[PDB]
């Protein structure tokens, strides 16, 4: 569990797996409650970009 925190900010997290929008779905699910910008920083993605 501690080791899995390394790929959260990487831009190649959904590699070697069918889905590539998992970060987008996580953002759309948890942003309204835990802070959209906070989740964006946690997942290493830019909503403006």
């Amino acid at each position: 569990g501690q080791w899995d925190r390394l790929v959260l900010n990487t831009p190649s997290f959904p590699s070697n797996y069918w889905d590539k929008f998992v970060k987008r779905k996580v953002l759309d699910k948890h942003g309204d409650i835990f802070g959209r910008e906070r989740i964006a920083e946690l997942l290493g993605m830019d909503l403006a970009s």
Partner: protein
């Protein structure tokens, strides 16, 4: 439930633990627990 919410605890500014009226409105609106018409009723019931 809102006391344990980080999105409202961060908005809490007073060292004594007090939360400004406007800040407490914005906290509800961010957490989306209560809708707009309900916001005013909660404001009224709050200890002005």
């Amino acid at each position: 439930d809102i006391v344990g919410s980080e999105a409202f605890q961060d908005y809490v500014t007073d060292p004594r633990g007090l939360i400004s009226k406007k800040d407490f409105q914005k906290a509800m609106d961010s957490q989306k627990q209560f809708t707009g018409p309900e916001i005013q009723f909660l404001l009224s019931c709050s200890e002005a």
